[PDB]
Every structure is written in C-alpha cells, then in structure tokens.
Design a protein around this ligand. Structure first.
Ligand SMILES: C[C@@H]1CC[C@@]2(OC1)O[C@H]1C[C@H]3[C@@H]4CC[C@H]5C[C@@H](O)CC[C@]5(C)[C@H]4C[C@@H](O)[C@]3(C)[C@H]1[C@@H]2C
Lengths: 15, 228
C-alpha cells in the first residue's frame, strides 16, 4: 500500500 | 492438454521477451564494458538529488514495463480495473528487482546501469549503502540459481498473479489465473528437473517496499527540487 506506485500504474494501464 | 500448457509457457516467455527492456544477449555481451575509475568518481560526485532523480526515473520506467508485461498475460485485462491495480501495486516492484538479476554480473559483483557495468560504489551519492548492498545480494542469490528465461518469465507472472492480495473484488478469477500458471510452471520444472529452485529464493518483499517508498518520496517532494 504505497500511493506513489499506484499513480505510475494507473497512468500506465491506460491506452 | 500438454500442448495447451506448453502454449501458455511459451506465451508468458514471449510477453516477457517483448517487455524486458533490454535483451539478455546484449546484457551479456556488454560485461566487458565497465565504468572507469574516472566515470565512478563522476557518479559519486553527483548531488544526492541528481542521483536519486535518475534512479527513480529508472525504477519508474521499470514499473511501466512490468505493467506492459501484465497487460499481455492471459486473463489480466479481463479482470476488473480494481483487481489489475491491486495485483500490480502489491507485485510490480518485486518483479522489477527479480528482472534486475539479468543485468547483474556475479563474477565481478557489478550491474548494468546506464550503458556500462558498475559496482556498489557507483551509487554512493544515493546515501543508502545498506539498501544498495542488499539489492546486490538479492541479485547475486538470484543469478546463482541460473534461471532460464522461461523460469524468470513464469516466476515473475506468479509474483503478479496472486489471489491472496488484500482488496480483490474477484478472488476466484485471480485464483483460476494463478492455478493455471502454477500448473504450467510445475510441468516445466518437472520436465527440466528444476523443482527445487523455488525453495532457494531470497526474500524480496521488504526490499521492494523500500524502493517503492523512495519512488514515492521523490514525487512527493519534487517542488523542493529543480525542475525535472
Ligand atoms: C535503489 C537502486 C536504484 C537504481 C537501481 O538499483 C536500485 O534500480 C535498479 C532497477 C534496475 C532495472 C530493473 C528492470 C530491469 C529489466 C531487465 O530486463 C533489464 C535491466 C533492468 C532495466 C534494470 C537495470 C538496472 O540498472 C536498474 C535500473 C537498477 C539500478 C542499479
């Protein structure tokens, strides 16, 4: 549960 | 069927080959290309922020390529977005550090970093000698097991695809994906006589957390440092 990684991962999952 | 299990093994390997950033043969060919003392001193004289910024960009880039890996795995896109995010949050930095062993040379205790091989010394400006040492150790233990590409591709898939991560909405759908990979990995290990390797695997959860914490810290504090 780290919020930094979630942001990278969310951005990467699009497209 | 047997060929069906064989399909999934080669397809996980394909997905790994396509998303692993650098080819193993390139990495192996460049073992002789080592940073000079001068070049080591160049990295060491960088600011803590300069060096961290670079390494966090690399760590970030790595995580994105693990996402690309996950995207190509059989049933991953079919899970709800929440599950996709839960599996990758819990798993990706561990996958990154396992991938890292391929760029590690166990003969001279060096790693491929920005176009040349260098030792722990290169990373003095990070101010975390213990973390660097631990990561080199983990890499050393992994290299010793002399993974096939298949072993790494399948093992890293299993790092990601895990039905036990807190906060899944569709546990059953993850379980089927995990079982199918386990069945496939088990067959491959049996036929190669490699059943015992996964007993020998060094613990990776703690280390990955610390890498993840650092990544978070640099993004959190980026307005108190020069423009990226
Ligand atoms: C805390 C420190 C920060 C810097 C560093 O070590 C850990 O972070 C580590 C993360 C590594 C990458 C992980 C993914 C690998 C995929 C594999 O197919 C090919 C090599 C890749 C790209 C690795 C290269 C390596 O130099 C790294 C940037 C390490 C670096 C030395």
């Amino acid at each position: 549960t780290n919020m930094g990684l979630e942001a990278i991962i969310r951005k990467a999952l699009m497209g | 069927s047997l060929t069906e299990i064989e399909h999934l093994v080669q397809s996980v390997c394909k997905s790994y080959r396509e998303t692993c950033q650098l080819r193993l043969e390139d990495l192996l060919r460049q073992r002789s290309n080592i940073f000079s003392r001068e070049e080591v001193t160049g990295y060491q004289r960088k600011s803590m922020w300069e060096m961290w910024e670079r390494c966090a960009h690399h760590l970030t880039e790595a995580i994105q390529y693990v996402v690309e890996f996950a995207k190509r795995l059989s049933g991953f896109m079919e899970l709800c977005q929440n599950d996709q995010i839960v599996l990758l949050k819990a798993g990706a930095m561990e996958v990154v550090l396992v991938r890292m062993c391929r760029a590690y040379n166990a003969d001279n205790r060096t790693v491929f970093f920005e176009g040349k091989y260098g030792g722990m010394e290169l990373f003095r400006a990070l101010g975390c000698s213990e973390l660097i040492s631990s990561i080199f150790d983990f890499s050393h233990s992994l290299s010793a097991l002399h993974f096939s590409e298949d072993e790494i591709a399948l093992y890293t898939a299993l790092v990601l695809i895990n039905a036990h991560r807190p906060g899944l909405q569709e546990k059953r759908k993850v379980e089927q994906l995990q079982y199918n990979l386990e069945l496939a990995f088990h067959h491959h290990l049996c036929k190669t006589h490699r059943q015992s390797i996964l007993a020998k695997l060094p613990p990776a959860g703690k280390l990955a957390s610390l890498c993840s914490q650092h990544v978070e810290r640099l993004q959190i504090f980026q307005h108190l440092h020069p423009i990226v």
